[PDB]
Design a protein around this motif. Structure first.
Motif, short mmCIF file in Angstrom:
data_model
loop_
_atom_site.label_atom_id
_atom_site.label_comp_id
_atom_site.label_asym_id
_atom_site.label_seq_id
_atom_site.Cartn_x
_atom_site.Cartn_y
_atom_site.Cartn_z
N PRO B 54 0.85 -1.18 0.00
CA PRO B 54 0.00 0.00 0.00
C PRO B 54 0.89 1.23 0.00
O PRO B 54 1.27 1.74 1.06
CB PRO B 54 -0.72 -0.10 1.34
N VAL B 55 1.33 1.63 -1.19
CA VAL B 55 2.10 2.85 -1.34
C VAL B 55 1.32 3.79 -2.23
O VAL B 55 0.89 3.42 -3.34
CB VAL B 55 3.49 2.58 -1.99
N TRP B 56 1.18 5.04 -1.79
CA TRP B 56 0.45 6.02 -2.56
C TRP B 56 1.45 6.71 -3.48
O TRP B 56 2.31 7.44 -3.03
CB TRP B 56 -0.23 7.03 -1.63
N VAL B 57 1.32 6.46 -4.79
CA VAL B 57 2.22 7.00 -5.79
C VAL B 57 1.47 7.93 -6.72
O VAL B 57 0.52 7.52 -7.38
CB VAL B 57 2.81 5.89 -6.64
N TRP B 58 1.90 9.18 -6.80
CA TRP B 58 1.15 10.15 -7.60
C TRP B 58 2.02 11.26 -8.19
O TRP B 58 3.12 11.50 -7.72
CB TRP B 58 0.00 10.75 -6.79
N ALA B 59 1.52 11.93 -9.22
CA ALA B 59 2.30 12.97 -9.87
C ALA B 59 1.73 14.32 -9.47
O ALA B 59 0.51 14.51 -9.42
CB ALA B 59 2.29 12.81 -11.41
N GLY B 60 2.62 15.27 -9.19
CA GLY B 60 2.20 16.59 -8.78
C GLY B 60 3.26 17.62 -9.09
O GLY B 60 4.19 17.37 -9.85
N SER B 61 3.12 18.79 -8.50
CA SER B 61 4.09 19.85 -8.72
C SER B 61 4.98 20.01 -7.50
O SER B 61 4.76 19.38 -6.44
CB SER B 61 3.36 21.16 -8.94
N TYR B 62 5.95 20.91 -7.62
CA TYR B 62 6.90 21.11 -6.55
C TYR B 62 6.23 21.32 -5.20
O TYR B 62 6.73 20.86 -4.16
CB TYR B 62 7.75 22.31 -6.84
N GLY B 63 5.10 22.02 -5.21
CA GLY B 63 4.43 22.35 -3.96
C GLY B 63 4.00 21.10 -3.23
O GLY B 63 3.91 21.09 -2.00
N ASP B 64 3.75 20.05 -4.01
CA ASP B 64 3.31 18.77 -3.49
C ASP B 64 4.42 18.00 -2.79
O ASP B 64 4.17 16.95 -2.18
CB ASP B 64 2.71 17.93 -4.61
N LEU B 65 5.63 18.54 -2.85
CA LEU B 65 6.77 17.92 -2.17
C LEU B 65 6.80 18.26 -0.69
O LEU B 65 7.66 17.76 0.03
CB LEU B 65 8.08 18.39 -2.77
N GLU B 66 5.84 19.04 -0.22
CA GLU B 66 5.90 19.50 1.15
C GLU B 66 5.94 18.30 2.08
O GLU B 66 5.14 17.38 1.95
CB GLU B 66 4.67 20.35 1.46
N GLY B 67 6.87 18.33 3.03
CA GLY B 67 6.94 17.32 4.07
C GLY B 67 7.66 16.05 3.70
O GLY B 67 7.79 15.14 4.51
N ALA B 68 8.13 15.97 2.47
CA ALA B 68 8.97 14.85 2.08
C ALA B 68 10.29 14.96 2.83
O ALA B 68 10.86 16.05 2.94
CB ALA B 68 9.20 14.88 0.58
N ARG B 69 10.66 13.86 3.47
CA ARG B 69 11.93 13.73 4.18
C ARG B 69 13.10 13.76 3.22
O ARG B 69 14.16 14.31 3.53
CB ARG B 69 11.94 12.46 5.02
N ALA B 70 12.91 13.14 2.07
CA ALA B 70 13.95 13.10 1.05
C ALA B 70 13.34 13.38 -0.32
O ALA B 70 12.23 12.95 -0.63
CB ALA B 70 14.67 11.75 1.05
N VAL B 71 14.09 14.10 -1.13
CA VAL B 71 13.71 14.30 -2.51
C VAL B 71 14.90 13.89 -3.37
O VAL B 71 16.01 14.42 -3.20
CB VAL B 71 13.35 15.78 -2.79
#
Ligand SMILES: Nc1ncnc2c1ncn2[C@@H]1O[C@H](COP(=O)(O)OP(=O)(O)O)[C@@H](O)[C@H]1O
Ligand SMILES: Nc1ncnc2c1ncn2[C@@H]1O[C@H](COP(=O)(O)OP(=O)(O)O)[C@@H](O)[C@H]1O
Lengths: 310, 310, 310, 310
Positions: B54-71
């Motif tokens: 159960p992994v949520w995989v989706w496409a978005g914009s830079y703003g959607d990177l909020e809270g990512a531990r790693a990019v």
């Protein structure tokens, strides 16, 4: 594939449980003198399987061990009040004299993994009785203690335990040797890399870690009266090594032609474990003190063996 | 928890896939200039999830990177005919000049894992543009090569790769240094433990292994034209290090104040990886030749940097 | 144990990757007309293995498929723009006429898992050419679509996808049938249990979900130009079913003597998958509309077959 | 991701063990009246962690339960032979009257998972003493029994257990109800799909399976004197449901406003389990006999409750 366990008490049953939760083996056969006990443990574990892995766990007789890649010998007698470690040792030696041939009769190809305490000596007795090559008889040995050592070190240095390479050798028990000498982290000497991090290992620290490793079994036995869980999972990992032909390094007890000057003794050294049992020995550098301590440990194991007639 | 990937091409998409099959993160966000591409990769992978995790995989914009531990920064330009490694490097440098601030705007709160080749230089560029502490910017570096080294050695000695400690350092590429010097197995010196089996490694053996490590990328690119899978899984494993605060040791590319006499260069050394990025450096013993080679590798990386204005 | 993959392109390679990251099979053999391609994929994946599982992944020839429990047929030709679906179909049918005997020559015991689109027809072609019993030839079929359906429903009802039992049947493609009729959650009728929660499934909800399932492949192909990842993992899961003798239920394509009035056609129905391939079929209740649609789908698959000479 | 366990005996410790081997939680706190016991279990399990997962397992006091998502209540007194089921129940009720307020004081956020037998009644006692909403207090209930039912059916049908939906409802004990009525496989009615495979279930087979389910706990207790392992793993799976907000379906014991005509009783029904505890109930079709048996079970649970003052 298939694993046998003879001796269905706390250690045997916990080993089965671990095999089952970790999904190591397809099949686990429990064999015990008390037929009803093995069956009960088997069914209890079977209840758990649907919440982990499709492992067939069942109770049967020696004959049912046919084709098991490995058989764990967990058997042994009820401790008895006012009886010397020696008398116990004797009664267990007798248990093994029953068990070994019968296990071998059914599953002549198996590797014997010896559980029962004291583990080095029992490993000797099983090697002797088996008439197998030495590497086919492996005792669980110091693995828990080695792992704990690596853990406390890891924790001191703020590093992943996986990056810590350190050993505990010899008798599994009070005389076990922690080799601080050649210990390393990330492939570089421990104590060096201690300065190299902000953490110079005072002798007081050394001592704190030593207590941690050395006295863990004592504390466990004082609070709950026996150890099962740790060794159950260790045995599981060894069984996995054997079944996957991992050829990985574990500090385990086996019959060793010579160690630190002592001849024909079973004890724990880093050994390469795989499908036919142990397949090679790794000699870490010891300091003179450590070598002296190892030598002592071996001597005393050897006199035990002799006192028992092995 | 949550992981960003910027640039959706073969490396980015393969990294997402690996994250997803291994069950590393809860959430994976793909960001690409070509929105349709990211969305298509996202949905393709989404289709796979029910057969792993159960992994949520989706496409978005830079703003959607909020809270990512790693990019992971996988972005980069189409390679173009008879264009020098330099011009390519330039166009990529400009891609990163776009991407970095945008990633850090949304997730000021992240570690940057640099994918894009050449990786050491790109890592330098990102470090420079980020204005973050050096350890928050990590390049994938030599990890694949270090692992394949360990593997070939493991296979030579008939031993589990886990028991082999060996490193590949410097520029990820033709320069890279295989440290045979301090390499060990089971915590004892490799070459010693070579005779300590059936082993001694001939120079033609060392050369056969060296070809094996070192020219692997070339072969992959000659047959299929690009590498993705290996690095996808490597990246996955580093991301896992970061999210679990593993503090484990990986040979990765980062800005280093001084290495082997060269100043302010990014390259691969063994480093301790954890939640804030790299948190410490491990210095294995180098032979004079190895040290010289490292010095060379660093020099050339550094002149590359300078040529580019970094 | 061992799995073969014939055709080394995006689907083949992705399937291999998935097998490897998930630790399904010990061995994965890639066989492709372009030898260099297969070898490059193999080595790229091999680079990934140390970050997941000890899987031996290599490229070889048909003969190297000996002993594989399953062989995935992923081969097939470069598309040519302006070329009718028919000519492509022809081109592939000939590919399979080349491949199938060769695969069965080396590995006469194997199960064939058919990847190549259009999957139902290719599955028929392979069944025909194999002369094996029907259940030995399994097409990947509608599994991704069934899983997606289950997923969207799960998400609508705020419930774990595991609890949702629903099917997609027939041709993998536009004419697929979503069976809403007999669909259930937790063993009770979907729409009922819809009122039993706070959500009554409006027809525009049904339609929204339908779009979600039926057109996914289209979107993926519009954005990235091909689908690999999802089917890579599905194929992996089916392979795992076959190797573990799972006897689990999957909607896959196989030769069916009669379905909904149509005779001798290959399409997706829920089937019990295990070591010898499919071993039984499960017939869910269909509504008259659903049955009609299924009948249509089958008719058209069958005329396709006939047009091709199968 | 932290889990509490109150009471340290066989069930508690086995639950901890399972949590740890399966890698469910990052942290496991053991709280027991006998401080030394908890500590010993903790350390024994800690010894096992290096062979599975980095789980921090330790013993502490109620205050140490702060932040736990779930706390398993395993406590309960020594069984005295002679002593009626009622006096025991009374002693246990008093234990819970101590424990519940203490657990909720430290971790007012958590979800109570009730272990202690008889489980339905203890679940009632906990619900009453908690003053929480009903779905915050969940008993382990019939899960082991439901899973074994599914298993025996799966075995009969030669199908994967995952494709078998069937339930066990009511009192966990002799008066539990196997619902044969609405049971299905692959989303189609069991008994139908029985003829649909070759071999329908004969009142004799139904009885053979019934014995297999209903009487398992009895045999386990006759052979080994207690059950732990199964419920340890079940509890683990429930804990995993809670922490991952799985919203999956499990037959568990909770306070139910009305069931089959009886008012305000705790017992097992299929319920949707997630982060806030149970979040919804699923009502399978019952036959009149099944219905009646359920109503009986509920009646008797309710009188038990009343006799105790709940
Ligand atoms: N000759 C024998 N053959 C098989 N099993 C035996 C024999 N003698 C004793 N046992 C079994 O060995 C088990 C030992 O269990 P236990 O006393 O808990 O020790 P441990 O904690 O080492 O397992 C007992 O359950 C007993 O039934
Ligand atoms: N400025 C940019 N911002 C975001 N994404 C970009 C930018 N430039 C290129 N990309 C993306 O990076 C990807 C490059 O990956 P690709 O060339 O397919 O292989 P690799 O993963 O080796 O780079 C392209 O798919 C492109 O969409």
């Amino acid at each position: 594939m298939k694993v046998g366990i003879v001796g269905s008490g706390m250690v045997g049953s916990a080993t089965a449980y671990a095999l089952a939760l970790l999904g190591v083996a397809r099949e686990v056969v429990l064999v015990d003198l008390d037929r009803k006990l093995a069956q009960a443990h088997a069914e209890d574990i079977l209840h758990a399987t649907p919440f982990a892995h499709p492992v067939w766990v069942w109770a049967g007789s020696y004959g049912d061990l046919e084709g098991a890649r490995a058989v764990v010998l967990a058997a042994g007698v009820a401790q008895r009040p006012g009886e010397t470690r020696l008398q116990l040792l004797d009664r267990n030696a007798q248990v093994f004299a029953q068990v070994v041939p019968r296990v071998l009769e059914a599953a002549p190809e198996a590797v014997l993994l010896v559980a029962t305490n004291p583990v080095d000596v029992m490993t000797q007795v099983a090697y002797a009785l088996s008439g197998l090559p030495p590497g086919r008889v492996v005792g669980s040995g110091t693995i828990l203690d080695t792992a704990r050592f690596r853990a406390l070190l890891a924790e001191y240095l703020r590093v992943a335990p996986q990056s810590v390479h350190a050993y505990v050798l010899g008798e599994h028990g009070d005389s076990e040797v922690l080799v601080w000498s050649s210990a390393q982290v990330g492939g570089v000497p421990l104590l060096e890399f201690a300065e190299a991090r902000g953490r110079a290992l005072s002798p007081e620290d050394r001592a704190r870690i030593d207590e941690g490793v050395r006295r863990a079994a004592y504390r466990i036995i004082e609070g709950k009266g026996a150890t099962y869980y740790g060794i159950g999972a260790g045995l599981a990992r060894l069984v996995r090594a054997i079944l996957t032909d991992e050829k990985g390094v574990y500090t385990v007890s086996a019959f060793t032609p010579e160690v630190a000057g002592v001849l024909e003794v079973s004890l724990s050294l880093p050994r390469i474990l795989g499908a036919g049992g142990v397949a090679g020995t790794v000699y870490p550098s010891l300091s003179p003190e450590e070598r002296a301590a190892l030598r002592r440990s071996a001597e005393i194991l050897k006199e035990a063996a002799f006192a028992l007639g092995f």
